[PDB]
């Protein structure tokens, strides 16, 4: 047998394939299906992807935003069926893969370090030029 393959096979019915690629440093908006008694609505959540940890189907990504004065971080399973959609808001240029350090930065200092990723912005805009 092949235990790794079987795990993949069990996960394949749940694996998502419709979300945009993104990187630590990118600003992003996750439209997340949320329930509130006894209906369910779509609550957007915008912020910077400070972290993505990869474990195949089990990859998860963390988004950080300030919100009415307080910093809020949220962790989403990248293949969660609760994610309606993900919009890429801004491509960010990070020098590392985990951006925990921006927790202790002023807004103006985060802007200085995570300058707009020109190269992948052009990639975005040069896509969407299609039939």
């Amino acid at each position: 047998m092949n235990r790794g393959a079987l795990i993949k096979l069990v996960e394949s019915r749940y694996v998502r394939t419709d979300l945009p690629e993104f990187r630590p440093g990118d600003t992003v908006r996750v439209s997340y299906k949320v329930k509130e008694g006894n209906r369910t609505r779509i609550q957007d959540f915008e912020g910077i992807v400070i972290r993505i940890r990869r474990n195949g189907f089990n990859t998860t990504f963390t988004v950080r935003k300030v919100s009415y004065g307080v910093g809020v971080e949220r962790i989403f399973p990248l293949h969660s069926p609760l994610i309606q959609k993900i919009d890429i808001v801004q491509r960010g240029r990070a020098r590392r893969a985990k951006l925990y350090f921006i927790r202790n930065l002023s807004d103006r200092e985060i802007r200085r370090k995570l300058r707009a990723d020109r190269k992948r912005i052009d990639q975005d805009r040069a896509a969407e030029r299609a039939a």
């Binding site: 235990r3 079987l6 096979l9 189907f57």
Partner: protein, 204 residues
């Protein structure tokens, strides 16, 4: 009262009714019956199942006579299931449906020689305030001249793990009969690759 042998494949999670579900994946089937235990012949009732086929170049002479007496191919392991008497001659995961509750026996991970703290969650000692080389030690083990001995069963360091463990009342989340897979919610004893037994639950 049904039962099947299997192998722990590994853990993952699925999504069921907008809920994350931690599941262990077990490769259980397929198990041939290799001997049936009858009250007449043996005094009790159980089925000697076999699991995982074996290269005959390793199955010795007295064991080949055992498989052949049942007309089954040589198998790697034989385990019984008490008070189980399947009508067929081969047991498969098709005996478990989603929603059912099972009990999984496995051989737990082996800690080896374990300390009193890792084994029995003893408090240990202080790490400052004058503690002298006793931070992980077990304290007192007794009284004085009365009784002047240590009880049988007083918890001390020693080996820990690599023993038979059974977890009760595990939900069955899914069955994938084409791959012989059995998705059970929770955790199962032992390492990936370990032998497991999956029986119907004794809980109500």
């Amino acid at each position: 009262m049904k039962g099947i042998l299997g192998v722990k494949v590994g853990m993952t999670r699925i999504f069921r009714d907008d809920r994350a579900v931690p599941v262990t994946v077990i490769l259980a089937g397929p198990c041939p019956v290799v001997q049936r235990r009858t009250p007449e012949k043996d005094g009790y009732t159980a089925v000697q199942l076999g699991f995982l086929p074996q290269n005959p170049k390793r199955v010795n002479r007295p064991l080949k006579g055992h498989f052949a007496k049942a007309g089954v191919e040589p198998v790697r392991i034989l385990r019984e299931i008490r008070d189980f008497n399947p009508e067929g001659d081969t047991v498969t995961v098709e005996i478990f449906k989603p929603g059912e509750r099972v009990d999984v026996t496995g051989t737990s991970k082996g800690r080896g020689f374990a300390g009193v703290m890792k084994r029995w969650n003893f408090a240990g000692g202080p790490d400052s305030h004058g503690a002298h080389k006793i931070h992980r030690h077990p304290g007192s083990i007794g009284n004085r001249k009365t009784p002047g001995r240590v009880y049988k069963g007083k918890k001390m360091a020693g080996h820990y793990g690599a023993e038979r463990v059974t977890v009760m009342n595990l939900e069955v989340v899914d069955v994938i009969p084409e791959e012989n897979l059995l998705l059970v919610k929770g955790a199962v004893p032992g390492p990936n690759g370990g032998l497991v037994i999956v029986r119907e639950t004794k809980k109500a």
